[model samples]
Target: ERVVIGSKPFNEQYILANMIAILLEENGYKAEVKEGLGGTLVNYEALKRNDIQLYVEYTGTAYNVILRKQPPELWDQQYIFDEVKKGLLEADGVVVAAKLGFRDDYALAVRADWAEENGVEKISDLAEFADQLVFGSDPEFASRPDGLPQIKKVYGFEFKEVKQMEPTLMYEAIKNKQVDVIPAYTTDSRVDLFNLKILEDDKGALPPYDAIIIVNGNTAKDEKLISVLKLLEDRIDTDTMRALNYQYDVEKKDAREIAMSFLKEQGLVK
Candidate 1:
């Protein structure tokens, strides 16, 4: 049987989907990638219908969005992972597999120089400076339950303006000083390259977002596929994934080419 991998519409997801497809093919399987298929709910439903065999998912998204539940006061990555894995299996027959050793959690960042000059060091510290800051974020983050609305309510932050834009343009907006702060993915390489300082989420406002591989029940039952995917567990760390995304987003490299290079470097492709 042929294996198909799917991805969300973003640079990181594209890289991961291509990586999985490449690795499977290198292991002697017939593999295909359906990159940038859609968003979280779209991909989840497609996986349920067997349109795709496997893809990557985050523990927090599975717990809060798919399961439609709120997380506890304490953020526990392992606990959320276990609950989502068990819940998906019992409810939908989906199998949540190995943790991919990386997380893409929500982060708020500012230009390093601006942060240092203003003495803003954490999310809680934003409350005092909120009135003077222009915050930029994607539409989804501007309104998600665990996003701006909740963040503002939790930290009592009311910014001078909240600019909503496409996620792709947020970094540039902040860097160019059009916006003083922006929501960012924790694993984004541009955070480091652009010299943005990530504020500590002192209030635990966002859920833990540990990355993991998720598969259809049928795919999980296939021993060969399981073994091949297992090779990726604990292999790709945050830095590695960010660098891969950097190649795609900044260097303009093809996702397939970047994924193949990683597999070759790991000696998974001979």
Candidate 2:
């Protein structure tokens, strides 16, 4: 049987879609990959229409962006997963097959020495120093309730100054000592490449964005497909994912080649 896979327009999604396609192709199924299909909503709409069998999606995006669920004070990853699955099946006719076991969400980052010298290892740890330091981030994070303002309300303090800039520039601003902290993508390689410390979200201020495999309703009934996809459950962790991304983005490795090696290393495909 043939299976169609969809991927959003990014290298991470591209690599994952290729991984899924490779698994299906090797498992005696015809696989067609539709790369760079607009983005989340587009891929989601296509899947709802049966235009694609499966794609990897972020839990945070699905829960908050797609389903429009108001985030609870503290999010339980499992509960969020349950709600996301339930909401998608009831509302969009799609089923999540497995959680691929990595989060690619917005997280806090600071220079390693700054984090160490100030004894800051988590989000709440920044509360005391927050007033004396500048915070830089994307405009969305600055304004969105799920972003800075909520953090301030929960943590009981706001930054001395909040600077909004392009996401990329936020990194440079922090690196150059112009900003003390910025919201960073958890799995972004630069978090490691630039030697920044990713502070733990101990208070659960942000929703989890675990990567999950989502299949359209009919495709969910395919036993073989589900089994192969489930093989990836809890397989890719954050560190492993960041390393893979580093190999692709910074080392300039071919995306599919990186996917192939990762599966081979994990012994997912022989």
Candidate 3:
């Protein structure tokens, strides 16, 4: 059988889509990948129309963005997964598949050495020295409820300055010391590549962002396909994903090549 995989516009999505495509091809399935097709909505629509068979999506994004519903406070990942599955099946004939076993939630990170030198270990710890640090955030984060405002209200910290710039630029700004801290994604490879310390969110202002696979209902009917896809369940954790991303973002490796390497390393492919 042939499968077309779709990916959102981002480094992580490209790498993951390649991984899925490679996995399918190696398992006796023909796979085609459409890279950077668009964002969540575009991918969801494509899947619904069976334009693509599968793609990686986030539980948080499915819950909040696609479904346009706020998850319950302190929501359980299993519950969210169940509800998201049910909602998609009922509303759009989509099937929620195996979780990739890692969350890519919102995070605040600082240079590891800087954090150590400043005695900053958690979001709450930044409160005391907020006046001395500059914050780099994406424009969306500056306005989102779960972004800076809510974090500030929850942790009681106010930064010296909140600089809003493109999401892709925030990491470099933080790394270069142009900003003291920045909003980051938990699974981003830069956290490891740049030796940044991800501060603990003690107050839990953000929701779970567990990575999951979403497929069209038609694709779900293929038991062989489903079983093959399930082989990836619980396989890619946060650290593994971060390293995969670092290979692409920092080492300038091709996404397909990186995905192939991971499959070979895991013995998923020759």
Candidate 4:
């Protein structure tokens, strides 16, 4: 039987989707990636319709948007994860698999030199220096209620200047000293490659968008498929993902090769 792995329309998702395809194929199952489908809803609905057997999803998306709920008043990474697992299975009969051990939450970052020189290691650490810094972000994060507004609410500080730029440009602008701080997605490879310091969300200002696999709940190969997910549990950390992403996005390596090399490094492939 052939398995179809679906991906979202982004480079990171391409790397992850191909990883799944490779893993499934190596386990003696025929597998293919549908490749860069529409956004969350499209890929999700396709999974529900049995057009794909597997795809990666973030728990926060499954909880809030997919299930039509607001952010919980209190954030619990484990609790959110449990709710997502149970809710998806009950709501759509999909099996939520390994967490993949990373979150792609909205986060903050600063130059490594700046952070180190100022003794800043977390979001809260930026407060004392905020008025001296310029903040750069993607267009959406600059105005989104849960973006700067939320950050200021929790951290109680404001930047000297706020600049909006396309998501890709934020990194380059920061590197060239056009900006001093930025709203960063936790797993973006450029953060790793450019030697930026990703500040910890000391206040849990952003919800954890933990990476997970949702499998077809009714598949006949349930046991074997779940075994594959189990082996991958807790194997890929946030830093590991950043590195993997760098290999694909910055180094321009083949996604399949990157996946297989990771599997080989972990002794999963001979």
Best by TM-score: 4
Q: What is the C-alpha RMSD of each candidate to the true structure, in Å?
A: 3.5, 2.0, 2.8, 1.9
Alpha carbon lDDT at 54, candidate 2:
90
Q: Which model is ahead, 1 or 3, in terms of TM-score?
A: 3
TM-score of every candidate relative to the true structure: 0.79, 0.91, 0.85, 0.92
lDDT of 1 by residue, 1-270 (tens): 788888899998998888888888888888888888888888899999999998899999999899987668656667788899999899899997678888898878899998898899899888888899998878888887767887887787689998878977778888889899888888887987788987877777777788889999987998888988889889888768888888987899999899889999998887
**Could you tell me which residue pairs clash in candidate 2?**
none
Residue-level lDDT of model 2, residues 1-270, one tens digit each, is 689999988878888898988887778888988989878899998998898889999988999888999879977777898999999999977888998888997888999988888888889998888789999877887888777887787777788988778875666788899898888888898987887988888777778889999999998998878998888899899888888888878999987899999988877788
* Model 3: how far residue 266 lies from native, Å: 0.9
Candidates 2 and 3 compared: the better one by TM-score is 2
Clashing pairs in model 1, backbone N/Cα/C closer than 3 A: none
Instruction: Give candidate 1's whole-model lDDT.
Output: 0.85
Better of 1 and 2 by TM-score: 2
> For model 2, what is the error of residue 176's alpha carbon versus the real structure, in angstroms, after optimal superposition?
1.6
Better of 1 and 4 by TM-score: 4
Model 1, stretches more than 4 Å misplaced? 71-74, 113-149, 152-170, 176-180, 200-202
lDDT of 3 by residue, 162-203 (tens): 887887777788888889888888878879978998887766
Q: Pairing residues by index, what is the TM-score of model 1? A: 0.79
Model 4 residue runs over 4 Å out of place are 138-140, 164-168
lDDT of 4 by residue, 132-243 (tens): 9999877777788888888888778999999878876778898999999987888888898778988888777778799998887786258988898677888888998988
Displacement of residue 232 (Cα, Å) in model 2 is 0.5
**Residue 69 lDDT, candidate 2, scale 0-100:** 91
Count of backbone clashes, every candidate in sequence? 0, 0, 0, 0
